[PDB]
Amino acid sequence: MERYENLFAQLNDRREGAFVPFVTLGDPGIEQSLKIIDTLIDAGADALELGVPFSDPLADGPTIQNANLRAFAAGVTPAQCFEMLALIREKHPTIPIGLLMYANLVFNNGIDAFYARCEQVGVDSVLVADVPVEESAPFRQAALRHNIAPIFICPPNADDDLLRQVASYGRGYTYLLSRSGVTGAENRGALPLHHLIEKLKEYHAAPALQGFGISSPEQVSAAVRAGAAGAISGSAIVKIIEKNLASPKQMLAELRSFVSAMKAASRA
Amino acid sequence: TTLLNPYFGEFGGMYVPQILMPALNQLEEAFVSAQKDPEFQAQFADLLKNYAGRPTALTKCQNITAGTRTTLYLKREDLLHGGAHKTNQVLGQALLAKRMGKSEIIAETGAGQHGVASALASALLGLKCRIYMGAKDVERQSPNVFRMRLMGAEVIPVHSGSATLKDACNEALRDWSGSYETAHYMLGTAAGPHPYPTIVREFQRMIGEETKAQILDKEGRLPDAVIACVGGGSNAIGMFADFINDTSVGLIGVEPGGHGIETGEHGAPLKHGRVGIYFGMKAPMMQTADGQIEESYSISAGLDFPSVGPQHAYLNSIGRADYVSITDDEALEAFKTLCRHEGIIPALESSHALAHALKMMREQPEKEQLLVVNLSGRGDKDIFTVHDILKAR
Numbered sequence: 001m002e003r004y005e006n007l008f009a010q011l012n013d014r015r016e017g018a019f020v021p022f023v024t025l026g027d028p029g030i031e032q033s034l035k036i037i038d039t040l041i042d043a044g045a046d047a048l049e050l051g052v053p054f055s056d057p058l059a060d061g062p063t064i065q066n067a068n069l070r071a072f073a074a075g076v077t078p079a080q081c082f083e084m085l086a087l088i089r090e091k092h093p094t095i096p097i098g099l100l101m102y103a104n105l106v107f108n109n110g111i112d113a114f115y116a117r118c119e120q121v122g123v124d125s126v127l128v129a130d131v132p133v134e135e136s137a138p139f140r141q142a143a144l145r146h147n148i149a150p151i152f153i154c155p156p157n158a159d160d161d162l163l164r165q166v167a168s169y170g171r172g173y174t175y176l177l178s179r180s181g182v183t184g185a186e187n188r189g190a191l192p193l194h195h196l197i198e199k200l201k202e203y204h205a206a207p208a209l210q211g212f213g214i215s216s217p218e219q220v221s222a223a224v225r226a227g228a229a230g231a232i233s234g235s236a237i238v239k240i241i242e243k244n245l246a247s248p249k250q251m252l253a254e255l256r257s258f259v260s261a262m263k264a265a266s267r268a
Numbered sequence: 269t270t271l272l273n274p275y276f277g278e279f280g281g282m283y284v285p286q287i288l289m290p291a292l293n294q295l296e297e298a299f300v301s302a303q304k305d306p307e308f309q310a311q312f313a314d315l316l317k318n319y320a321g322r323p324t325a326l327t328k329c330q331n332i333t334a335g336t337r338t339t340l341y342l343k344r345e346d347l348l349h350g351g352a353h354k355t356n357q358v359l360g361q362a363l364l365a366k367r368m369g370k371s372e373i374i375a376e377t378g379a380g381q382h383g384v385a386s387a388l389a390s391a392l393l394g395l396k397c398r399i400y401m402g403a404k405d406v407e408r409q410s411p412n413v414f415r416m417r418l419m420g421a422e423v424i425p426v427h428s429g430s431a432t433l434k435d436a437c438n439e440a441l442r443d444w445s446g447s448y449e450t451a452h453y454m455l456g457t458a459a460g461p462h463p464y465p466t467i468v469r470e471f472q473r474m475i476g477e478e479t480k481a482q483i484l485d486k487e488g489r490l491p492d493a494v495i496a497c498v499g500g501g502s503n504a505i506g507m508f509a510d511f512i513n514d515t516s517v518g519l520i521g522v523e524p525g526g527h528g529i530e531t532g533e534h535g536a537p538l539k540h541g542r543v544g545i546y547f548g549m550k551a552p553m554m555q556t557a558d559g560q561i562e563e564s565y566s567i568s569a570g571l572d573f574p575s576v577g578p579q580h581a582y583l584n585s586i587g588r589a590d591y592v593s594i595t596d597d598e599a600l601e602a603f604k605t606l607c608r609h610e611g612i613i614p615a616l617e618s619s620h621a622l623a624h625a626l627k628m629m630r631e632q633p634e635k636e637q638l639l640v641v642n643l644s645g646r647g648d649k650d651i652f653t654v655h656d657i658l659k660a661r
């Protein structure tokens with residue numbers, strides 16, 4: 001399919017950036033996670049980044065470490081996540097859906113089979129957090145054989161060779177890291193660089209989404225003004241889940257208010 | 269792009285977030301440079317000799333083998349400063365950190381021995397050391413935690429995941445992903461992403477080099493086999509490395525069998541796990557059917573790394589090394605036997621290697637065989653564990 005291409009084309013037509021929340025699938029349970037995700041969409045999410053619970057999320061700070069732990073407390077498995085994904089797609093035909101994976105869950109019972117399952121449930125992209133471009137070949141090849149975009153990461157100090165590789169190998173969107181370190185709203189990254197955003201454009205890369213530390217409307221607006229196609233926010237969204245575990249209705253209300261505010265910041 | 273091969277056959281690699289690739293490339297470059305630098309080599313040799321106490325003895329154990337055709341030597345890493353082989357490679361990594369201009373060290377530890385080794389090297393060489401340790405390990409390793417603190421290291425409990433070694437490994441990498449510009453990650457075994465399996469081997473290879481010289485001196489020929497326990501694989505690859513090209517020398521690695529392979533409660537991923545990708549490497553590991561990482565179990569807390577170094581997986585695949593397992597009860601019997609018959613208290617880790625050697629002798633007592641067991645550490649730390657079990661008997 002061409003869900004990211006279609007989205008960016010539509011957003012470009014409206015001089016608009018993308019706002020893309022991250023949540024952990026099945027945090028804090030399957031039924032509530034499905035409701036959370038429907039709320040994110042109704043409040044204006046342009047695409048989703050969805051984490052499959054993993055025992056050792058080594059690119060994630062405490063907020064998302066805790067989301068994984070909550071999903072495991074609810075007994076959430078990758079199989080259940082694929083069930084959730086199929087239902088999400090059945091409800092929402094056009095929204096781009098990206099997975100945040102760790103390598104072992106992809107490689108576990110066969111790389112090709114993993115990407116085939118993604119295609120079957122209607123996933124659009126897969127970002128494997130612990131696979132650098134240098135190790136990416138079997139993952140990106142399998143992705144493309146199954147019409148899945150492999151997402152690659154552009155660190156803020158990326159050199160020319162790396163920019164060229166990320167531009168060539170990735171599809172769907174280019175992940176623009178705001179800073180070194182791990183996920184977390186407590187650590188704000190940078191306005192990227194004209195250089196990076198411009199070089200990616202020069203090399204015809206997939207449109208950039210800035211992520212890590214994005215927790216406020218002002219940062220979304222800033223990312224888009226800098227030339228990114230949009231922004232990803234995870235910890236700030238997950239914190240609302242964490243804060244409101246005992247209050248599921250209030251959780252959804254606060255998620256709605258926050259996502260609405262973040263999305264508004266992306267509009268021209 | 270790298271200067272050295274990051275793989276051993278299919279095993280190994282550099283499976284880290286993109287943000288950490290420059291750190292690994294920097295470390296590899298510094299290592300390759302150091303390896304060609306006679307001054308670096310002389311500084312390392314000086315610390316090993318005058319601070320750590322190398323060369324370590326090679327002890328012929330005559331009482332243990334009486335009445336058989338086995339001749340058994342123990343390579344005495346138990347006599348190295350700190351009481352285990354880990355001291356060798358921490359000194360080399362500390363000097364690499366200095367070479368690169370870094371003033372801070374990060375380390376992970378499970379049972380605490382690597383933490384103590386990292387702390388002592390950092391104290392000596394003027395580095396600020398912070399050590400990640402799963403909260404459950406902190407609770408159960410108060411002696412080692414106190415040693416680390418006395419040596420001026422910061423110990424940081426890790427409460428995430430299972431609150432054990434794998435979780436400390438993650439936290440170390442999370443820290444490094446933000447701090448690499450000023451801090452070096454002093455990884456504690458011959459595993460993780462390239463270049464660590466290579467560096468740790470090269471900074472442990474004096475074990476086998478000395479063993480070869482010592483056995484030639486005493487016996488006039490190479491060993492029939494060298495035998496070492498395998499946690500993550502550092503002491504074993506250190507013993508094996510100099511003998512890899514001596515095709516007649518058997519290389520035997522011993523994984524912990526815990527309560528028995530058939531119980532599932534073991535730490536033997538090389539022979540009984542499944543290949544996965546974790547901790548920066550493709551290697552056999554302890555994992556669930558779905559691919560979640562699991563703990564290793566052994567009576568010896570030092571053998572609880574839930575995977576194995578990729579060079580071991582490779583040496584196994586080509587048949588250059590054989591890997592076996594030894595249960596808790598077998599290790600305990602070897603521990604008792606060495607104490608009573610040789611007056612040496614071995615680490616319970618090392619007791620796994622000794623137990624396999626004792627089996628080689630006992631199963632075939634008229635087989636002529638010259639064996640060397642790597643005695644990776646001393647067992648003072650284990651006396652209560654052994655006491656408590658033997659009391660409940």
Ligand SMILES: O=P(O)(O)OCCNS(=O)(=O)c1ccc(OC(F)(F)F)cc1
Nearest residue numbers: 059100129183184212213233234235285
């Ligand atoms: O808003 P924050 O700071 O919590 O960041 C949320 C990011 N969530 S995500 O799925 O895009 C994401 C993207 C990349 C990650 O690691 C990698 F760069 F190494 F690949 C981890 C998570």
Ligand SMILES: *Cc1c(COP(=O)(O)O)cnc(C)c1O
Nearest residue numbers: 457499500501502503617644645
């Ligand atoms: C840590 C330890 C081991 C196991 O680690 P390796 O990296 O496999 O050597 C073995 N023996 C002793 C004494 C240890 O402290």
Ligand SMILES: N[C@@H](Cc1c[nH]c[nH+]1)C(=O)O
Nearest residue numbers: 377378379380381382456
């Ligand atoms: N758990 C052991 C060995 C180890 C494995 N990885 C790092 N260290 C120790 O910390 O001493």
Ligand SMILES: [Cl-]
Nearest residue numbers: 275277278279
């Ligand atoms: Cl390869």
Ligand SMILES: [Cs+]
Nearest residue numbers: 221265266267
């Ligand atoms: Cs705006």
Ligand SMILES: [Cs+]
Nearest residue numbers: 321322323324
């Ligand atoms: Cs000595």
Ligand SMILES: [Cs+]
Nearest residue numbers: 333334336338
């Ligand atoms: Cs003998």
Ligand SMILES: [Cs+]
Nearest residue numbers: 498499535576
């Ligand atoms: Cs092992």
